[PDB]
Amino acid sequence: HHWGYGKHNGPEHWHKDFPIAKGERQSPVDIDTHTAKYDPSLKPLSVSYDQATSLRILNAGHAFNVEFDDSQDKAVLKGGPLDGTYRLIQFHFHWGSLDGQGSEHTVDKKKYAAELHLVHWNTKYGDFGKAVQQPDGLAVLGIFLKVGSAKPGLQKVVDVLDSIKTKGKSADFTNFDPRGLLPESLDYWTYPGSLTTPPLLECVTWIVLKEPISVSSEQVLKFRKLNFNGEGEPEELMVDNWRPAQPLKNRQIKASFK
């Protein structure tokens, strides 16, 4: 039936409806730190989120998304391996049922408790829909979450989850500053990949940060109380909404640091 993360509709079944699932540049992948190539040509990342305008938080079924106004260059990502300006449209997370799993990308096979994805699209394409049809249409910033000390900047997100427990529910979410979710350092790995959920389009430049952010056990616990199901339906907890690592194939992962 509809795709998901269950036993009968999980990632291993996706290829039946989305053949590209077995493509040449699928994500996520395992980052082998000893095989990554240091590239002195890579520029520092430029994150300009000072004018970011968040609008709403939505339970999309497979995750919850925090949406931003992308009708102007308010919150953009530039530099790094990117050519052009990419506007932030939304961010969401992937997490597990236990602290030992949850992230999509892994580092030397190590899994993190969760993974934050800040999605941006290339403005030269006019809109997000056009952008996903291009090889350099999207730029996704990936940040790992490890369980430890609480992240003050994440609490605002945590407190509103009760209002969007089931699929389809949304709530106004204005004046949220995404800068509170960034680690201290912006050193990264980068490689050409895809969207990790259907339609799995191979239109993404991945920028995965080396430094994880820490969140508290209580904070991640609240993520696990969300439901995949819609109201009035049998409760299915939203956990383990991550896709396992895919073959790197003929791709090279580059590092901005040595």
Of 25, 117, 120, 243, which one interacts with Zn ion (CB under 5 A)? 117
The residue among 56 and 126 lying less far from Zn ion, judged by its C-beta, is 56
- Fill in the DSSP letter of residue 97: S
Give dist(CA 210, CA 182) in Å, integer.
Answer: 11
Give dist(CA 168, CA 64) in Å, integer.
Answer: 10
Q: For residue 92, list its beta bridge partners.
A: 117
The residue among 73 and 240 lying less far from Zn ion, judged by its C-beta, is 240
Min separation Cβ 92 and Zn ion, Å: 6
* Reduced DSSP (H G I as helix, E B as strand, rest coil) percent helix, strand, coil of the chain, to 5: 15, 30, 55
Residue with tokens 């609240």: 222
Q: Name the one range near Zn ion by CB under 5 A: 25-33, 112-120, 147-155, 164-172.
A: 112-120
Q: Is position 117 annotated in a ligand binding site?
A: yes
Min separation Cβ 63 and Zn ion, Å: 7
| Count of residues that bind Zn ion according to CB under 5 A | 1
Q: Is position 92 annotated in a ligand binding site?
A: yes
Query: How many CB atoms sit inside 10 A of residue 142's CB?
Result: 22
When asked if residue 120 is in the footprint of Zn ion (CB under 5 A), the reply is no
When asked if residue 167 is in the footprint of Zn ion (CB under 5 A), the reply is no
Give dist(CA 239, CA 22) in Å, integer.
Answer: 24
Active site residue 62: yes
Catalytic hit among 2, 62, 105, 120? 62
Residue 118's closest CA among 66, 166, 45?
66
Q: Name the one range near Zn ion by CB under 5 A: 113-121, 123-131, 161-169, 215-223.
A: 113-121
When asked if residue 62 is in the footprint of Zn ion (CB under 5 A), the reply is no
B/e letters for 217-229, b = 16+ CB within 10 Å, e = fewer, are eebbebbbebbbb
Chain residues that interact with Zn ion, rule: CB under 5 A:
117
Q: Which residues are catalytic?
A: 62
Can you say which residues are annotated as belonging to the binding site for Zn(2+)? 92, 94, 117
Can you say which residues are annotated as belonging to the binding site? 92, 94, 117, 196-197
